[PDB]
C-alpha cells in the first residue's frame with residue numbers, strides 16, 4: 001500500500017483499539033531477560049529442544065513477519081536478533097484469542113513476550129510465546145536497508161539508521177569506546193578532568209568567525225569557545241599540574257567532510273613536560289588505542305572511498321618526524337632566510353606557489369604561505385603510517401614556546417593521518433614578557449603569577465573516530481549532524 | 486607598599502636576570518619525584534635523619550618565606566606541602582653564591598630543586614637543596630586568605646583560590662569524583678554514553694540564540710538533552726545517557742546558572758518505581774563512596790550557622806504532591822486542577838496563608854507554589870521524593886495507571902532544592918498534545934517503548950556534598966560581567 005495510506009490505517013487502528021477499551025501503550029512490562037543474554041544463555045540448546053518449564057519475559061522490536069496456526073517473527077533488541085515462533089499448541093487461550101492477537105502485529109511494533117526458550121526443528125534459536133502483548137505500535141512503514149543506503153535520511157532520521165543497518169550501531173559503539181579509552185588513558189597517568197565555560201567574552205582567535213549569542217541576565221553578547229586552551233592553562237597556574245577536558249568547541253565556518261562547526265575536542269596540559277614528552281605520549285596513545293580496538297597495530301582505511309582500493313595504516317611506533325621549514329626547503333630546492341615575514345622570503349614563497357604546481361594562492365600573509373606549502377609538499381608524504389610535522393616557525397604559533405636551539409622556530413608538533421590534521425601540541429610559552437599579544441586579559445594576568453614549564457596537546461576526536469571506523473565524512477561519526485531543513 | 490611597585494620591581498628583576506645571562510624561564514626541568522610521592526616515600530624516617538646519598542629533582546611553588554645561613558620555604562605541589570631547608574653547608578657554590586640565590590626568591594615563585602630527602606631537627610619532612618633554580622616567577626603579590634573571603638576574587642581568578650585555599654581544591658576534586666562515580670555507575674549497568682548536538686532548530690525557558698554562518702540559520706542552544714536521547718531509544722539504544730552542559734537564558738542566582746551541567750539517562754522498559762530504586766541506590770552509594778558513611782553535615786544557613794545532618798540511608802520518604810498539599814491545607818482539590826473551582830480553592834489557600842500570589846496564577850503555577858510552601862521543606866534531614874505530579878505540570882510524563890489527572894513523576898529534594906527529575910515517558914504520540922520538536926514527534930510514531938527517563942543536577946549535587954551554598958562555588962570559572 002501507499003506509505004501515506006499505511007500510516008492512516010495504523011492511526012485509525014490505535015484509536016479504534018482505544019474505542020474498544022484497550023490501552024495500546026501499556027505502562028510497564030516486567031522483563032526478565034534481554035535478547036543478548038537470551039542468546040548467550042540458550043545458544044547451545046539441542047536442534048529442536050524445548051525448555052517448556054522455564055518461562056521468560058522478553059522484549060524487542062519485530063522486524064519480520066512470516067506465515068494458519070503457526071506464525072514466525074524476528075525479534076531485535078540491543079543490536080541482536082532471535083526468532084519468535086507463535087504456535088497454537090503453546091498459546092494460552094485463557095488470556096485472549098490467538099488469531100486476533102497475532103493478526104494485528106506488523107513490522108516495527110515493540111512487544112513483550114511471555115514464553116519459553118527453544119530451538120526450531122530446523123535449528124533456529126527461538127522464543128516460543130504463550131502470550132504476546134503489544135507495548136508500542138509502529139505507525140509508519142519501515143524501509144529496507146536498500147531504502148536507507150545512499151540517501152541523506154541516515155542523518156535526518158538516525159534512529160532508523162541504528163535500527164536497520166547493523167554497521168551504524170558499531171560505528172557509534174566504537175566512538176564511545178574511543179572516548180572511554182582516552183579518558184581512562186589520561187586518568188591512569190594522573191590527569192584530572194575539569195569543566196571550563198563554553199561561552200566567553202573574547203571572540204575567536206585568528207582562525208574562524210565565532211558563534212555569537214546574547215546573555216539575557218547580563219545583557220551581554222558572548223562567544224562560544226573555539227578551544228579550552230586558555231582556561232586550562234590558568235588551572236595549571238592554580239596548581240592542577242595534570243588537567244584535561246573533553247567537550248565541544250565551535251568554529252562558525254563552512255561545513256565539509258573533515259570540518260564541522262561543532263566538534264568534539266580533548267585538550268590536556270601537563271606541567272613540567274616538554275616537546276619530547278608530548279611526542280612519546282602521542283605515539284603511546286595511538287598505538288595502544290589501535291591495539292585496544294583491533295588487537296593489532298595495522299588497520300585498513302578506504303581513503304578514497306569504498307569504491308576504491310583501501311590503504312593499510314600501520315600505527316607501530318615510532319612515527320616519522322618531519323621539520324616543516326627544512327623539509328619544504330629540501331623538496332623545493334630553495335632556502336628561505338631570516339624572518340619569514342620579510343618581503344624577500346614572502347616573494348620567494350609566492351614565487352614557489354606559482355612557479356611550482358599552480359596550486360591556489362591565498363591572502364598572502366607569511367604564515368598562510370608556509371601553511372599551504374606544507375599542505376602541498378609534506379602532508380601527503382606518509383599515508384601508510386602516522387607522522388609528525390614539527391618545529392613550526394613562531395610566526396605560525398604565537399602561544400608556543402621558542403625553540404631551544406633553532407631561532408625563529410617553536411617546539412610544536414602536529415600528527416597527520418592520511419593528510420588530515422589529528423593532533424596539535426607544543427610546549428607552552430610561559431614568559432609573559434615574550435608573549436607579544438599581552439604587551440585574553442585574564443589569561444595574560446595569570447601568566448604574570450607564574451606558569452610552570454608546560455606541555456599542551458589537542459586531539460580531534462571526530463577525525464580519529466573517522467579513521468578508526470573507516471569513514472570518509474565526519475557526518476558519519478556524529479549521531480545528529482546539523483542539516484539544512 | 487603599592488602593588489604596582491611590587492610588579493614593576495620583579496618585572497625589572499626578571500630583565501635584570503636576563504641581562505646577567507640567566508634565563509628565569511627555562512624550557513625543561515627533569516623532575517625525579519612529585520611532592521605527593523615525596524611525602525609518601527619519606528614520611529616515617531627519624532627526626533633529623535638525612536638520606537644524603539639519594540639526590541632528587543623536585544619542583545613546586547614557594548608559598549611562604551622565612552629568614553642567617555639557614556633559610557626555610559614551603560614547597561606546595563598537587564595540593565600537598567613540604568618544607569625546603571636551604572643550608573649553607575650543602576649549597577653548591579660552583580653554581581653561585583648561597584646568599585643571592587635564595588634572597589631573590591619570593592612567595593609564589595616556581596622553582597626546581599636538586600637535593601636530598603630528610604626530616605628537620607624538629608621532625609618536619611624537608612627537601613635539602615644543593616641547588617635551586619627559578620622556573621617561573623610570580624610577578625604579583627599573592628593575596629591572603631582573608632583577601633579572598635568577602636571579595637569576589639575567587640571567581641575572577643580561581644587559580645589564586647586553588648593555590649591559597651586548601652578547601653577549594655578539595656571542592657573541585659570532589660566534583661570530578663562525583664561525575665566519575667556517576668559515569669561508572671551507569672556504565673556498570675550497561676548504559677551507553679553518547680553525544681548530542683548543542684544547537685538545534687526547535688528550542689520552559691528562554692533560549693540562547695546564535696547564528697549558524699554556513700546554514701544562514703538562527704539556532705538555539707539546547708535547554709536539555711531530553712528529545713534526542715529519546716530518539717536514540719527508538720533507534721534501539723535501550724540504555725542511553727549523556728553528561729554535558731545545557732543552557733537556559735534566564736536569571737542567575739545561588740542555585741540557578743544559565744549554563745549548568747546535567748546528566749540525563751533513558752532506560753527502556755523501566756518505570757517510575759525503577760527510577761526511585763535507581764535514585765536511592767545511586768545517592769546512598771555515592772555518599773558512602775565519598776565519605777565512608779551515609780550521613781553528611783551541611784550548612785544550609787551558611788558556615789556562620791550550625792550545620793544540619795543529612796542522612797542518605799535508603800529508603801527515602803515519598804510524598805504525593807496533591808494528596809499531601811490537601812492534607813496540610815484541609816482542602817480537597819477536584820478532578821481538573823485548571824477548573825475554575827479548583828483554581829478558586831488554591832487561590833483561597835494562597836491568600837489565607839498570606840502567600841505571594843503567582844502572577845499570572847495558572848493552575849500549574851499555583852500548585853508549584855503551594856508545594857514550595859507546604860511540601861518542599863517538610864522532610865529536610867534526609868532526601869525525599871515528591872511524586873505523582875498532575876499531568877498539567879508534566880506534559881512529557883506518562884499518565885498515572887490508576888490515579889486520573891496525575892503522572893508517574895518523581896522529584897528528589899535535598900534541603901529544599903530539587904536535585905533529580907524523573908518519570909515514565911509518555912510514548913503515545915496521539916496523547917502528546919505538543920505534537921499538533923518536529924523530528925521528535927515523527928520518531929514517536931515509529932514506536933517508543935515504555936521508557937523511564939531521569940535528569941540529575943550535577944552542580945547542585947556537588948553543592949550539597951562539598952558543603953557549599955552557592956552554585957558559583959562548585960563551578961571553576963563562573964561567567965561574570967568584566
Ligand SMILES: COc1cc(N2CCC(N3CCN(C)CC3)CC2)ccc1Nc1ncnc(Nc2ccccc2S(=O)(=O)C(C)C)n1
Pocket residue numbers: 207208251252253254255258259260261262263421422423424458459460461462463474
Ligand atoms: C567549520 O569547521 C572547522 C573550521 C576550522 N577552520 C580552520 C580555518 C578555516 N579552514 C580553511 C581551510 N578549509 C577549506 C576551510 C576551513 C576555517 C575555520 C577549523 C576546525 C573546524 N572544525 C573541525 N571539525 C572537526 N575536526 C577538526 N579538526 C581539525 C581541523 C583543522 C586542524 C586541526 C584539527 S584537529 O587536529 O583535529 C584538532 C586538534 C582541532 N576541526
Ligand SMILES: COc1cc(N2CCC(N3CCN(C)CC3)CC2)ccc1Nc1ncnc(Nc2ccccc2S(=O)(=O)C(C)C)n1
Pocket residue numbers: 689690733734735736737740741742743744745747903904905906940941942943944945956
Ligand atoms: C538560569 O538558570 C536556570 C533557569 C531555570 N529556569 C526554570 C526555572 C525558572 N525560575 C523561575 C523562578 N526562580 C526563582 C528563578 C528561575 C527560570 C528558568 C532552570 C534551571 C537553571 N539552571 C540550573 N542550574 C543549576 N542547577 C539547576 N537545577 C535545577 C533547577 C530547577 C529545577 C530542577 C533542577 S535539577 O533537578 O537540579 C536538574 C535535574 C534540572 N538548574
